[PDB]
Symmetry: D2
Subunit: 239 residues, 4 copies
C-alpha cells in the first residue's frame, strides 16, 4: 500500500506511464502525471481517478522541468518515463534529432532527479524508477541514439543508488521489451508477428504488464532492491 506517498510519473498520460500511475493511485498514492498536452493530460488524470492530478511539462525544456519541480516539490516515488524514441540509422541520423533525444531523455530527467532526490534524502526514504529499453542492452539497427540515451539512464541508476542509498533512497531501472496496447481483436485469430516470434514468450507485452514491475520497485515491497535493472521483456535479453 502506498497511502500517504506522493508519486510523480513523467509522461504519464499514455502507455506505460499511464498504467504505472493507474496502479499506484489504486494502491493509495497521491499521483501526479505529466505530459505535453493539457487536454489529454486532464483526461488521463480523470481516467486514473483517485485524486490523480496533471501537471503540464516538457522534459526537453529546463524551464518547464523547473516549473514541474516547483509544482510537485515533495515526491516519495518518481517514475522517469517521459521520453521520445525516433529511429534512424547512424548514417541517416541528424544533429537536431540527436540533441533533442539526449536533452529530453537524459538532461530533463537528470535535473528533475537532482531536485526531487534532495527532498527524498532529507526525509530518509524514496524510490526512483527509470524506464529504459532492451535497445540499451542489445544492439538493434535504427535505435543507436534512443538506446544510448536509455543506457545513460541505466548508468545513472547505479550512480544515484550509490549517492542516495545511505539515506534510504532506492533507484532502479525497468527495461521493457516489445510493448503494445492490446486491441479488442487480439485474443482472436492465429497470426504471430516476427517481433513476438523472436521472444521466448512469443507475444508482446501490454503496458499494464510493464507497469506491474514499476509498481513493485516503487513500493516498499522492494525495500532491499536498488541499483539494479528489472528486465520486463518476455525473455528478450536472455536470448
Amino acid at each position: 500500500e502506498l497511502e500517504g506517498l506522493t508519486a510523480l510519473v513523467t509522461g504519464g498520460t499514455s502507455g506505460i506511464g499511464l498504467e504505472s500511475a493507474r496502479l499506484m493511485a489504486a494502491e493509495g498514492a497521491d499521483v501526479v502525471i505529466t505530459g505535453r498536452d493539457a487536454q489529454r493530460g486532464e483526461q488521463a488524470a480523470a481516467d486514473i481517478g483517485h485524486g490523480a492530478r496533471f501537471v503540464q511539462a516538457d522534459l526537453g525544456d529546463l524551464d518547464s522541468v523547473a516549473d514541474l519541480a516547483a509544482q510537485a516539490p515533495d515526491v516519495d516515488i518518481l517514475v522517469n518515463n517521459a521520453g521520445i524514441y525516433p529511429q534512424a540509422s547512424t548514417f541517416d541520423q541528424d544533429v537536431a534529432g540527436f540533441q533533442q533525444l539526449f536533452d529530453t531523455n537524459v538532461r530533463g530527467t537528470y535535473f528533475l532527479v537532482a531536485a526531487a532526490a534532495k527532498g527524498m534524502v532529507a526525509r530518509g526514504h524514496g524510490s526512483i524508477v527509470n524506464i529504459t529499453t532492451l535497445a540499451a542492452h542489445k544492439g538493434f539497427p535504427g535505435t543507436s541514439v534512443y538506446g544510448a540515451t536509455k543506457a545513460a539512464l541505466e548508468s545513472l541508476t547505479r550512480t544515484w543508488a550509490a549517492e542516495f542509498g545511505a539515506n534510504g533512497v532506492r533507484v532502479n531501472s525497468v527495461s521493457p521489451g516489445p510493448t503494445r496496447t492490446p486491441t479488442t481483436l487480439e485474443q482472436l485469430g492465429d497470426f504471430i508477428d516476427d517481433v513476438a516470434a523472436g521472444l521466448p514468450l512469443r507475444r508482446t507485452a501490454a503496458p499494464e504488464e510493464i507497469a506491474q514491475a514499476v509498481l513493485f520497485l516503487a513500493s516498499p515491497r522492494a525495500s532491499f532492491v536498488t541499483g539494479s535493472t528489472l528486465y520486463v521483456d518476455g525473455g528478450g535479453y536472455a536470448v
Copy 2:
C-alpha cells in the same frame, strides 16, 4: 492473488524459503515446503498456516527428489531455494565437499525442474524462481564452489526460459545479497558492521525482503518477466 495455484518451495523450513512460502500461502496458494528434518518441517508448515504442508526431501539425493516429485507432481509455482553453502579457499577445498555442493545445489534442482516443468508446459502456465547469490556475479574469496553452483542456476534460468517460454512457463532468478534474520535488539544501538557498511543501503536484508521479490516473480504480476535475474542486494551488484 494465487488462489488455485500450488507452490512448491524447496528448503522452505527457514530463512528465505520459509518467508517466501509464508507470503504465497497468505496470498491463497496451496503451499508445499521441503526440508531435511521432519519435526522442524511440520512446525514450519504450522507456522506458515493456510493449509501449507511439509514433504521431507534431500535435494542431494536423487531417490529423495524422485519421491518429492511423486508427492507433489502438479505444481504451478516452483521456488528452488534448497542448497548448502560451506565456504573454503580454492586451495583448501576438498573433493567430497565440492561434489556434495554441486549434487545438492545443481543436480537435485535440475531434475526436480525437469519433472515439475513437464506438467507446467502441458498445462500452459507456470513460474519457476531460482534462488542464487551475489557471489555468482562478483568474486568473493572463500565462495568459489558455492558461487559456481548458483552461477550454473543463473544460466539454467536462461536456458529454461527459452525451452519453456513458448508454453507460457516463466523462469527467473532472485539473487540475494547479505541477508540475516533480524534480532529484537537491532533497532537499538549504533554499531554498523563491515558487511552492511559496504552496501549502498548500509544494512543487511531480512529474509522477508528477499521473499517479496520471490513472490513478485512467482505471481501473475510478473507475467512478462522471464529469463532474468532480479538482484535483491541493497546495491551490492551495482557497486
Copy 3:
C-alpha cells in the same frame, strides 16, 4: 601488423590515447592523433614517430569534428578516446557542465563515427574502439554524468556492431579501471593507496597497459570480436 592501415586516435596527445597511437605506429599503421593544443600535438606526434601526424580537433565542436573528418576521411582504425571527465555530486552538478560533457564525450564521437564508418563499410573492413570507464558499469559517487556519457558509448558499441558488422566492420569498447602514468619512484617504497588496495591486482594501471587492449581490438588479431566490452581494470568490475 598494421601496415597499410590508417588509424585515427582522438585525444591522442597524452595518456591512453598517446600510448595506443604509439603501439599502432610501431606496428606499421599510419597514425593520426587529435588534441586541442597544436604545440603539444606536434610534440606528441614526434614522440610517437613513424610518420604519425597531428590534427587539431575539439570533439565538443561539430565544426571542428567536420574538419577533422575532412582531413582524415579514409580511416581503417578509429579509437574514440577524446573526452572530459569533471566530477561532481548529482546535487552539485551544473547545467553547463552536463551539456559540455555529453556534447564532447557522446555527440562529437557519434558523428565522427557516422562519417568514418561510412568509408569502412564501403571498403568492407574496419575496427572502431570506444574508450569507456568502469564508472559506466558500477556506481561511483561524483561520476554520474561522466559515467553516463561512457555508458552511452557502450550501447553505441552494440548498435554500431549490429549496423556495420555485415560489411566487416567491428566495434568494441575498452573499459579502463584506475589508470595513472607511473613515476620514477613508484618501484620504490611500500605505501599502497586506497584506490589500488580495492582492486584484485592491488595496483593502478599504466596507460600503456590499457593501450595493449586497444591495439588488440583494433588489429586483425581480434577478427571475430565485435559488439563487446573488454574490461582492463585490475579486476574492478569482477569485485
Copy 4:
C-alpha cells in the same frame, strides 16, 4: 613473447585448444597439451612443433588430473579448454550425462587450477584462461547442462581473480560463439547458413580466431586484465 614461460592447454589436440597451443609455442612458450588419445596427442604435439609435448589426461577422472598436475607441476599459463558438449532438452537429459558433464567440465578443471595456481601464487605471476561459451550467457534450447557447466567456470574466473590477484595471478574467460574449422571450399560459393546469418559478422569463426583472444589474455600484453570475460562471438552476445 612468452620465452621462458610454460603453458599448459587441456584438450589441446584439436580445435581451439590446438590453435591456442600453436600460437603460444610460436611465441616461445614451452607448451604442454593434453588429450585422451596418445596417438593423436603425439601427432598434435608434432604439428605444434617448438618442443611442445603431450600428456595424456582425462579431465573427468581425478586420478588422471592428479597425474597431469604431477607431470606438469610448474605452469605459468594454464588454458582450461578440455570439455565435452553433448546436447539434449531438459526433458530428455539423463542423469549419467549430467554427472559426466559437470565432473569433466567443472570438477576436473577446478582441482587442476587449485594445484597449478598454488605454484603461480608462490612465484608471484601467472595467467589462467577458462574457455566458456555463448550458451553460458544466453539461453539456447538443448544446451542447458553444457551452458551451466561453463557458467560455473565464468563465476570461478571471478572468484579466482579475487583469490589469486594479490599475488599477481590473472584469471579470465574467453567466451566463443559459433566456431568451425574452415574447409578448402569455404571461400567459394554463396550459401550462408542460418547460424552465421544470425551474427553481426555473418560468419562462423575459425578456431585460430578464438585462439588469438586466448593468446592475448595469456600473455603479458593483458597485464591489467583479470576477472573478466572476453567475448569472441562475431557479435552474438551483443544482439
